[PDB]
Design a protein around this nucleic acid. Structure first.
Ligand SMILES: [Mg+2]
Length: 861
DNA sequence: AGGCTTGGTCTGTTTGCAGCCATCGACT
DNA sequence: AGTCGATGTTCT
RNA sequence: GGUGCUGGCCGCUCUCGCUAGAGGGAGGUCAGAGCACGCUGCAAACAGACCAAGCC
């Protein structure tokens, strides 16, 4: 079967070093360091020079100046050298040649494997297959197919090679040797192939990381000045004229500031609102051409101004990369540096043959590690144990499973504390089938039919919905060609469900009073300004905030110190529950979550008590205390969300998730999840722990997955006071279920639909739809080039003719099979919204039921 | 008391570049 | 047999 | 048995202060383990947090 390896690495703290290495490391982080800032100029990279006063703005012409002013003669070769260096990969086979002083060349090109296969079948190979092999080969075109053909007919295969190798050689490999002598280039060590071979690719490994950014950072400047001057309307002609006369008067302009300006200026309103400076400038004649603008044609003139102002804050070219910080030095078995390795008294040892031996410590991640050398790879076998602090604890150390893997190179780094670490970039022999199916089959709209036939009969899926509430609600399922069932999967068949959907981490107990503890910090932020706003006016304080302050046993009624006792009593609460949760190791994520935010508002509060005394206009330059906690903690919770999500998804082959970082609706900027814990870092941290077990992961859209009904597709209402419940109107009977459960089904639904079944899209006139939108209109109604008609009851119809009466350039919603419009999707929400308000009784419907024959959401048949 | 816009200073958050080497030929 | 230098590819 | 994460106590220092106290910060010190673990360099865009004004 086909396998695919997965790159991972975990630390190893080095204790002692032996030999001349210490100088050796310091030389590479000085040889790298030394020449990287010189090679910067050779490709003429336009660079800002970092400075406290600003950033100087050097241009390519101001940098191409010193290219020939630094190399008068190597220029005509260096440009050929940089390309054969920027291509990289390995066909640049020996770029190290310039550093190595004894660099020898051979007069023959090497006998490559693909260079052998081409000669023995030179007699019969067709020219419409001979020329498609060589055209794409760097060494083969240099001889035209004429003299290629003659040797195949006359000569037996083995004789031909003896006379073509000095002809098809890649003459770029000499470019390195010339530059050293013509430039007087000396490194620190020069007969040492290791020192050279590593350093060449190492500096290159840091440089190519800058070239592709360079042409990509630029190609944005070419796409940004295209999409600012493509939407210049007579509405842009006066929208930016609004901010010019706003900054002179010392003001600015926002987004939701926009809609209450014309509604108060279209009826004589003599009592201003928060935007009177706009309303008084929305009564002048030069901005009276703005009050009369349309509905949607102004959202497409707000983004350009919100896009143009990003063109002006952006620098014209990248900064200069700072190279002083130590880089992760890699050393590999074959070709690069040479190393051997052992486990000495369960303590790791590393040996480098020319330059002496490192020393190493016993590690917990590799708990029962073993090593056996094979000629190309190291084979490791180990498991994960726990970390053993207590000696007479009844507590067994958690045993991980054994891991069979391969390892071929090692990494080294100094940390700012002066410690040398050692890394192990290891590869995992795992089945590629799950990944192979993941990208090609579920991600995309239509896979080729030779790919669809790459499926076994039955396989397992999963999904969940994650919001800040009770985070994980999974559902496992079974999909089958043979087996019939209630969920429709595109191109694979029907499926029937094993477990789920259930919530797995319900919000723990201590949360209820920790939010109640957050409110205690909520009032301290608004109250500290009351001590600071009456210091400027001369007034006293409000009793309602004062009455709250007295709730503490405070030995002084002074307003100042009672503030401090509500906070010391608050810090103790955080200090205490810190301890009693540290006992556990944080086994309830849902608990630590509302605690994490509680740890946030406390640190967010101490920055206003240090700045209480400050008279108006003098600040405190709060410095980095390199709080190591808040950074390396909120990571731990994410790498702990894996364990609860992996445990329930081990037996699955594929997983699905809600990608909350995509084109979402408007309420997702203030949302805490983009603020509290990264979606993609969490989804990727799941992927990294899912890839580890050879289980594919494929995201799907985030557009209204919580909203739709899994059974009937009809709309629902996420209760605006209780986000955990959601309501539905079907069959003249009201129903209710759990929202963050509902989302798990709609993600499982949309997953088996390849995200094809849409939620909302924008019309045009038969500006094209994406390839994932097409397969819906073609499969159901008949084609892609279709206009849409408003019809009886205010529905929408798909017409196979293309008339001009119809609505074009608008927006829709999809429910149960019917294409409905926007003024109806409000009405449809309005249908449930009113029934709940009138205090009617609904019927809860679990989705674990068997009475359901088929789920009709995101399926078309 | 609260509700935005502007800017500065400081960390913190979310991304796409580079990478995780095999094989012959000369020589022991 | 074995070491270490120097050399080899191409689709999205 | 490598990196994380935690509270008391001690002083030390720092900041304010209706005088009551609080809050930091790198280390010296008393307590707790059913806690997961892709390491790393260059780069770029937002948002988050506090002091200032004008404005309704
Ligand atoms: Mg949700």
């Amino acid at each position: 079967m086909k396998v695919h390896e997965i790159p991972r690495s975990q630390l190893l703290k080095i204790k002692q070093y032996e030999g001349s290495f210490v100088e050796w490391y310091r030389d590479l982080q000085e040889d790298r360091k030394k020449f990287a800032s010189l090679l910067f100029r050779w490709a003429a990279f336009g660079y800002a020079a970092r400075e406290d006063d600003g950033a100087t703005y050097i241009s390519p012409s101001q940098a191409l100046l010193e290219r020939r002013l630094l190399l008068g003669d190597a220029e005509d070769v260096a440009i050929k050298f940089l390309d054969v260096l920027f291509k990289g990969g390995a066909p640049s086979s020996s770029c190290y040649s310039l550093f190595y002083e004894d660099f020898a060349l051979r007069d023959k090109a090497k006998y490559s494997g693909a260079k052998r296969e081409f000669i023995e079948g030179l007699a019969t190979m067709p020219l419409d297959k001979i020329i498609e092999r060589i055209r794409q080969d760097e060494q083969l075109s240099k001889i035209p197919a004429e003299e290629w053909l003659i040797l195949g007919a006359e000569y037996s295969p083995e004789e031909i090679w003896e006379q073509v190798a000095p002809r098809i050689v890649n003459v770029d490999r000499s470019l390195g040797k010339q530059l050293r002598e013509r430039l007087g280039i000396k490194c620190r060590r020069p007969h040492d192939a290791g020192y050279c071979k590593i350093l060449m690719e190492v500096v290159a490994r840091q440089l190519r990381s800058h070239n592709e950014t360079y042409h990509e950072y630029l190609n944005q400047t070419h796409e940004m000045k295209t999409k600012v001057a493509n939407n210049l309307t007579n509405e842009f002609d006066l929208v930016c004229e609004f901010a010019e006369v706003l900054e002179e008067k010392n003001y600015g302009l926002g987004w939701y500031v926009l809609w209450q300006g014309v509604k108060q200026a279209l009826k004589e309103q003599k009592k201003p609102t928060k935007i009177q400076i706009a309303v008084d400038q929305l009564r002048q004649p030069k901005f009276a051409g703005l009050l009369t603008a349309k509905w949607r044609a102004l959202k497409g003139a707000y983004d350009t101004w919100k896009l143009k102002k990003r063109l002006e804050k952006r620098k014209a070219f990248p900064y200069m990369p700072n190279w002083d910080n130590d880089y992760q030095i890699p050393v590999g078995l074959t070709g690069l540096g040479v190393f051997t390795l052992e486990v000495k008294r369960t303590e790791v040892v590393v040996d480098l043959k020319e330059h002496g031996k490192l020393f190493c410590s016993h590690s917990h991640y590799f708990g029962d590690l073993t090593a056996e050398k094979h000629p190309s790879r190291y084979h490791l076998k180990f498991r994960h144990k726990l970390k053993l602090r207590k000696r007479d604890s009844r507590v067994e150390p958690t045993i991980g499973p054994w891991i069979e893997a391969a390892l071929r190179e090692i990494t080294i780094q100094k940390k700012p504390n002066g410690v040398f670490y050692l890394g192990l970039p290891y590869a995992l022999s795992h089945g590629i089938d799950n990944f192979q199916i993941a990208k090609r089959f579920f991600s995309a709209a239509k896979p080729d039919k030779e790919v669809i036939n790459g499926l076994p009969s039955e396989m397992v899926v999963g999904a969940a919905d994650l919001n800040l509430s009770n985070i994980v609600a999974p559902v496992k399922a079974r999909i089958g060609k043979g087996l019939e069932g209630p969920l429709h999967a595109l191109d694979y068949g029907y499926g029937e469900l094993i477990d789920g959907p259930k919530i797995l981490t319900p919000d723990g107990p201590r949360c209820g009073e920790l939010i109640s503890l957050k409110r205690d910090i909520v009032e301290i932020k608004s109250a500290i300004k009351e001590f600071k706003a009456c210091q400027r006016e001369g007034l006293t304080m409000s009793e309602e905030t004062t009455t709250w302050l007295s709730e503490v046993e405070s030995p002084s009624d002074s307003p100042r110190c009672m503030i401090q006792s509500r906070i010391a009593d608050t810090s103790r609460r955080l200090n205490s529950f810190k301890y009693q949760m540290n006992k556990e190791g944080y086994q309830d994520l849902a608990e630590a979550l509302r605690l994490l935010d509680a740890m946030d508002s406390y640190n967010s509060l101490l920055e206003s008590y240090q700045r209480m005394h400050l008279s108006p206009g003098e600040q405190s330059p709060k410095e980095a205390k390199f709080d190591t906690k808040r950074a390396s903690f909120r990571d731990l919770l994410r790498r702990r969300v894996a364990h609860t999500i992996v445990e329930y998804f081990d037996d699955c082959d594929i997983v699905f998730f809600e990608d909350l970082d995509g084109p979402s609706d408007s309420d997702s900027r203030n949302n805490a999840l983009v603020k509290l814990l990264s979606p993609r870092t969490l989804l990727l941290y799941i992927r990294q722990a899912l890839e580890k077990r050879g289980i594919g992961m494929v995201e799907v859209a985030k557009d209204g997955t919580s909203q739709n009904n899994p059974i009937s597709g009809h709309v629902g209402w996420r209760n605006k006071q209780n986000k955990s419940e959601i309501y539905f109107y079907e069959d003249k009977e009201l129903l209710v279920m759990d929202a963050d459960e509902v989302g798990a089904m709609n993600i499982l639904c949309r997953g088996l639909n390849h995200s094809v079944c849409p939620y909302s899209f924008v019309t045009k006139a038969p500006g094209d739809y994406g390839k994932r939108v097409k397969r819906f209109l073609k499969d159901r109604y008949g084609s892609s080039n279709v206009r849409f008609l408003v019809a009886s009851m205010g529905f929408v119809t798909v017409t196979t003719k293309r008339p001009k009466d119809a609505l074009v350039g608008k927006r829709l919603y999809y429910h149960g099979g019917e294409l409905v419009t926007h003024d109806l999707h409000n009405r449809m929400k309005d249908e449930i919204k009113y029934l709940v308000e009138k205090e009617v009784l609904a019927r809860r419907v679990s989705l674990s039921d068997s009475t359901i024959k088929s789920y009709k959401s995101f399926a078309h048949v």
